[PDB]
Amino acid sequence: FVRLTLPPPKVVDRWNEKRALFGVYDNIGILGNFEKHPKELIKGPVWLRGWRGNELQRCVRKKKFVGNRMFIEDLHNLNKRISYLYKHFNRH
Amino acid sequence: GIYTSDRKFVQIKEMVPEFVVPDLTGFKLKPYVNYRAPAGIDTPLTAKALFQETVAPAIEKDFKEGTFDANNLEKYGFEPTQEGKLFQLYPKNFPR
Amino acid sequence: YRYGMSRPGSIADKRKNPPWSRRRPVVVEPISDEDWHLFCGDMVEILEGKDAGKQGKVVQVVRQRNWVVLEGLNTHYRYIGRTKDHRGTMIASEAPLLHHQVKLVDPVDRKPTEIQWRFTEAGERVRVSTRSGRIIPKPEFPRADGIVPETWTDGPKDTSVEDALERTYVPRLKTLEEDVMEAMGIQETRRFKKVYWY
Amino acid sequence: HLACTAGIFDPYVPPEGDARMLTQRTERLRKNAASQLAIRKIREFDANFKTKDFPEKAKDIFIEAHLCLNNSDHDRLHTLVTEHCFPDMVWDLKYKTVRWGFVESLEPAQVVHVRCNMYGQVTVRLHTRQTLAIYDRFGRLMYGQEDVPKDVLEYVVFERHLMNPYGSWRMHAKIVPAWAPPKQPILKTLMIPGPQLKPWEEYE
Amino acid sequence: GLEEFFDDPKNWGEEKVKSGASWTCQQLRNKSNEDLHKLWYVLLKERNMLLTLEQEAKRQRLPMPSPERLEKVVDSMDNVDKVVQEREDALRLLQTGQEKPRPGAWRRDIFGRIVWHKFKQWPIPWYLNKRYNRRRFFAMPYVDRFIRLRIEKHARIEARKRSLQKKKEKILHAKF
Amino acid sequence: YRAPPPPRRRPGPHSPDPENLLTPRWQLTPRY
Amino acid sequence: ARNVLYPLYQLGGPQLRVFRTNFFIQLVRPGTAQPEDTVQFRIPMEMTRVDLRNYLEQIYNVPVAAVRTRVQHGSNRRRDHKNVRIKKPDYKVAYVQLAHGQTFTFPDLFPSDLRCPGIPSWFGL
RNA sequence: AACUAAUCCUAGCCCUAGCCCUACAAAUAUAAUUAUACUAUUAUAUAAAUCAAAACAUUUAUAAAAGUAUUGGAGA
C-alpha cells in the first residue's frame, strides 16, 4: 500500500562549496608540469587507489595489501569466499 | 558451631556473636536532625588529615627539640604489628 | 522514553511512556550546564507562544526537554474533575515553553537581552548581558516542600538544634571499635591462631 | 493558576420594582460607604475605574461574548469571560446551532455594587431585549423564537485579577433577581418516570 | 522494648509524622567514635520501627504515614557507616599502607583475564591445601585465540557504537 | 567561495628515522 | 550482621562480638492463629534463632521463652512482560514465645433546569 | 462513510575511511559461583577431506619482467 502522508519538502543547493569546488585541480598533471599525476588525487581503499580490477582481483589485492592487518575471522572468511570465486571464474 | 562425630551439633560459644548494645541514656543524638540545622559539607577523613591532626604536632615539637629517632617512631603512634589488638587493621579480623 | 510535563515515574508518566511504547524518540538539542541560563524564579520574556512578549517568572524547568514553565503565562483552560456525575471544572493550566522561546530580562531595563555567563568577585556564576553589560542576580525561590528551616519545630525523634551542632570527635590514635572498648572497658586476652591468607 | 474565584464576595440584594426605576444612582451615592472603599481598591491598581463609565465597557464584553456563541468562537469567548463562566455558557450547547441577536437595550447599564490575593467583582445591572432560537443536530428548532424579542433584566458580575499586571475585566457570573419572570419553556414535552420498586415491593 | 517497635500512640491515625532532616556526613564526623556507635543503634531502632509499621501496613493494604522517615534514617545510617569506615581506612593505611582491609592480589583465570583475587584465611597453608591447589589460576594455551577475539570484539563494539550514534544523528539533521 | 591552495609535493631530501619500526627496511638500505 | 565476612575461629581464639548490627527485623501480626505470648517476626534469612534470642534480650531487653522459625519459599511463578520469571524474596518467619509470664497483643495500628434541559443555566434569555 | 484491514519513520544495519591494543557487599573451578583442610594440578602432530580434473589414482591457486618459461594422469 501507498503513503497517506506527504514527505518533508526538500531543497538542494547546487552552488554549495562541495559542488562548486568539485573537479578543481583535475588537470593537476597537465597544468602542474606533471609533477603530480591525477591518479595521486584518488581517495579510497588503499588497495584500489589508481587501480581497477574485477571482483576477484580486487579481493586478492585487498588480501595482499592488508593481510598482515586483517582479522583472523575476516581472513578466514576471505579465503573461503576466494575459493568459491576462484572455482567459478576459472572453471565455469 | 561445629558438627563433631556421630552427626552431633556442638555449639561453639566463641563463634556465637555477642551483640554489644550501646547505652542510649543521656545520648542526645536521635534518628532525625533539625531542618533548622544546616547541612554539613562532606569532608572525608584521610590518612594525611589524621596524621596532621595527631601525629604532626608531636613530631614537630620533637624534631625542633631534636629528640627524634627511628626507635621512637612507635611513640608517635606507629604499630610495628597488628597482633595483640582485638581489632586488627590489616588483615581485617574483626566484624562490624 | 519521551519526557513530558508530568513528572517522571508518575502515574501520568506511565501512561505517556508505557513499557511497550516504541514511538519515534523526540530529538532535543543538548544544552550544556554552563550553556543553560534559565532557573526557577527567573524573570524572562516569552519570545514566541500564546503569551509572547509577556514577562514571567519561571516555576518549573524540565531540562531534558529544554522546557521552561511560567506561572500564569501560556496558560490554557482545561477541565479538572471530569466525572460521570459532573462535567468538570475549568482551570488554567500552564504549557511548556522551550528554552529558545524565552530570554532573560535585565532588571533596570526590561528587554530580552542576550546574556553571557561570567563569574563575580564572590565567585558565584552570574549571567551578564551581552549588550549593556549588567549582573542579573540569582532569584530567590521558595522551598518546594514549603518547610522554612527556621520555622521548623523539632518533632519526636528529632534532635534539638544545639545537639546536632555539638562536636565531640577528638583526633586520637584509636579506631572506633577501640574507642568503644575504652568507654565500655571491653578487654580480650584470647588470640586467634595463625591463618594463612590465600 | 487561578484568575477567578467561584462565587461572589458579598451578594447584592436587588429591590423589587427596580425595573420601573438619577434615583437609583443616588442610592449608590448613599451606599458608597459600603462600596467606595472597594471602589478605591480597584482604583488603586487602575485609577481609571469609575462606576459611571464601567457599564459601557462591561456591556460590550457581555454582548460580544453572546455573539461568540453563534459562531462558537470559544477562543474569543474564553478571553471575554472567566474560567468559571465559560463552561456553563457552552457545555449544554454541544452539537447545537443557536441564532442570537441583541435588540436595543431597554435601560442603560449601571454599576450596582462592587467587592474585593485580590479579586474584584463588579455587579452590573442590564435590561435588554434579545432574540434566541436553538435547533437540533438535524436542524429542528427546539427552543426559542427566530425573530421574537424577549425583554430580560439581569445583574451581571464581572471580575478582574487586580494583582496580576495583565489582569483584565472578564465576565464571571450573573445575579438573577427573584422578581424576574421565569424563562420561556422548552417546545418539546417531557415525561417524568414513576417510582422504581423491586419485585417484592408494591406500588406506594 | 515492645513499644519501641511501634509508633507513638498519639501519632497513630495521623496522616503523617513530623520529622526533620537526616544526619549529614560532616555532622557525624564531628561526633565522637563512641557517639557514632551509639547513634547507629538509635537509627537502627527507628528503622526497625518504621519497617515494622510498614510491614503491618502491607498486611492491612494501607499506606505508610510519612514514608520519608525511613529514607531519612537509612540515609543517616549510610552516612554513619562511611564516616566510621573513613576513620578505620585512614589508620590502616598509616600503620600498614594497605589500601584494602582484606589481603588480595592480581591473578590470571583459566580464560586469560586478569582479575583481583581476594585472599581467604585458612587454617592450613596453600601448599598443604590440595583443594586450593586444585583451584585453577592458570590460562590454557587455547586462550590465545580468545584473546584475539576479545581485542576484535572490543573493536567491534566501537564500530557498532558509531553505527548507533549515526542513526541518532540522522534524526538530529532531520529534526534540525 | 575561494578554492583551496593547490596540493604540492614536498621537495628536498627526506631522511627516514632508522629506529622507527614502521619505516620499511628497503627505505633504510644503502641503495636508498 | 548480614552480607559481611565473619572472623574464622581457632582454638583459643577471641569470642565473637558484633559491635554494629546490620540485622533488621519487623514485627508482624500473625497470619495464623497463635498464642498471645507467641510473636511472629520477619528476619533476614542469614540470622539464626539463637541470634534472635540474643538480639531481643540485648537490644530490646525482651525476655524470650521459646522460639520456632520457618523458611517461606518465595513464589517464582510470576513473570514479567517479557515472560521472565520473577522470584519473591525469601523471608524467615520466627515464632517467639515470651518468658516471665509476659503476654503480647498486636497494637491496633491504623485504627440546567430539569424542566428545560439542554439550555445552559447561564442563559437568562 | 465499514467491517475485517490499511496507513507511517526510526528500531537499527552495511561497506570503506580513520584507528591497533595496553576498558557494591558476598560467592566461586570443590558439585564453579557452597565463608576454613577432603582429591593434587595439565591443551596440542603436515590440517584433512569435500572439492577440480565433468569418474578416479600423481596432481588441484588460497610494480614491471609475466601469465613469458618450465613443471604437470603435458590435464584440471
Q: How far apart are CA D110 and CA D126, in angstroms?
A: 7
Determine the protein residue whose CA lies at the shortest distance from the C1' of H5.
A1
Residues of chain G contacting residue B20, judged by C-beta atoms under 8 Å apart: 17-19
Contact status, residue C138 vs residue C126, Cβ threshold 8 Å: yes
F6 CB near a chain A CB, below 8 Å? yes
Interface test with D, best of C59, C69, C77 (most D CBs within 10 A): C77
d(CA C125, CA C109): 21
Would you give the end-to-end CA distance of chain G in angstroms? 80
How many other C-beta atoms lie within 10 A of the C-beta of residue E7? Answer: 22
Q: How far apart, in whole angstroms, are the C-alpha atoms of residue D172 and residue C184? A: 75
Query: Closest by alpha carbon to D170, among D99, D118, D119?
Result: D119
Q: Helix, strand, coil proportions of chain D in percent (round to 5)?
A: 25, 30, 45
State, as a whole number of angstroms, the distance between the CA of E104 and the C1' of H40: 23
Running DSSP on this structure, what letter comes out for residue E11? T
- How large is the angle between the packed helices C176-184 and E33-60, nearest 10 degrees? 100
Residue D1: list chain C partners with CB under 8 A: 71-72, 75, 92-94
Q: Which of G119, G120, G125 has the CB atom closest to D150's CB atom?
A: G125
Query: CA dist E93 to B77, C187, D178, Å?
Result: 13, 25, 91
Cis previous bond, B91, omega within 30? yes
CA distance linking residue D2 with residue D25, whole number of Å:
33
DSSP letter at C179 equals H
SS3 (DSSP) at G118: coil
* Contact status of E25 with chain B (Cβ, < 8 Å): yes
- Cell match 562511611: residue? E82
Query: Who among D2, D87, D166 is closest to C92 (CB)?
Result: D2
Residue nearest to nucleotide H11 (CA to C1'): C22
Are E83 and E25 contacting, i.e. CB atoms less than 8 angstroms apart?
yes
Which three-class secondary structure state does DSSP give residue D76?
helix
The CA distances from residue E15 to E6, E11, E46, E63, in Å, are 16, 9, 19, 10
Yes or no, beta carbons of C180 and B20 under 8 Å apart: yes
The three grid cell numbers given for residue D114, joined into one nine-digit string? 462592587
CA distances from residue D185 to B75, D57, D59, G115 in whole angstroms, order as listed: 107, 32, 27, 8
Instruction: Report yes or no: E24 and B33 within 8 Å, Cβ to Cβ.
Output: yes
Of G119, G122, G124, the CB nearest to D143: G119
Contact in structure between C70 and C56 (CB atoms under 8 Å): yes
User: Of D61, D59, D70, nearest to D133 (Cα)?
Assistant: D70
- Counting as contact any 3 or more CB pairs under 8 A, the partners of A are E, F
Q: Which chains touch F (3 or more CB pairs under 8 A)?
A: A
Protein residue with the closest CA to the C1' atom of nucleotide H10: C24
In angstroms, rounded to a whole number, what is the distance separating the alpha carbons of residues G125 and G116? 13
Greatest Cα-to-Cα distance within chain G, rounded to the nearest angstrom? 103
> What's chain B look like in SS3?
CEEECCCEEECCCCCCCEECCCCCCCCCCCCEECCCCCCCCCCCCCHHHHHHHHHHHHHHHHHHHCCCCHHHHHCCCCCCCCCCCCCCCCCCCCCC
Q: How far is E74 from chain A (nearest CA, A)?
A: 52
Helix, strand, coil shares of chain A as percentages rounded to 5?
50, 0, 50
Mark whether B and C touch (3+ CB pairs within 8 Å).
yes
Q: Which residue of C has its CA nearest to B78?
A: C173
Give long-range contacts, CB 8 A cutoff, 24+ apart: D21-24: D24/D110
Subunit contact G59:B19, Cβ cutoff 8 A: yes
C-alpha to C-alpha distances, E74 to C143, C154, E8, E81, E136, nearest whole angstrom: 23, 19, 20, 11, 41
Place of cell 474564553: D78
Whose CA is closest to B43, among D119, E87, A37, E161? E87
* CA distances, C29 to each of C35, C95, C108, E168 (Å): 12, 19, 32, 12
* Distances F19 to C71, C74, F24 between C-alpha atoms, Å: 71, 70, 11
Residue whose cell numbers read 562425630: B5
DSSP F28: G
Contact check, Cβ <8 Å, E24/B47: no
Give the containing element (helix H, strand E) for A62.
Answer: helix A55-66
Q: Where are the beta strands (DSSP E) in E86-148?
A: 104-108, 114-118, 121-122
Q: Exposed, middle or buried by CB within 10 Å (0-12, 13-18, 19+), for G37? A: middle
Q: What is the rounded distance in angstroms from the CA atom of residue G65 to the CA atom of residue G56?
A: 11
Other chains touching C, judged by 3 or more CB pairs under 8 Å: B, D, E, G
Pairing of strands G26-28, G38-43: antiparallel
User: Phi/psi at B54 (nearest 5 deg)?
Assistant: -105, -50
At a CB cut-off of 8 Å and minimum separation 6, what does E124 contact?
C196
Three cell numbers, residue B27: 545520648
Buried/exposed G55-84: b ≥16 CB within 10 Å, e otherwise: bbeebbebebeebeeeeeeeeeeeeeeeee
Give dist(CA G73, CA G75) in Å, integer.
6
Q: For residues E93 and E101, is the Cβ–Cβ distance under 8 A?
A: no
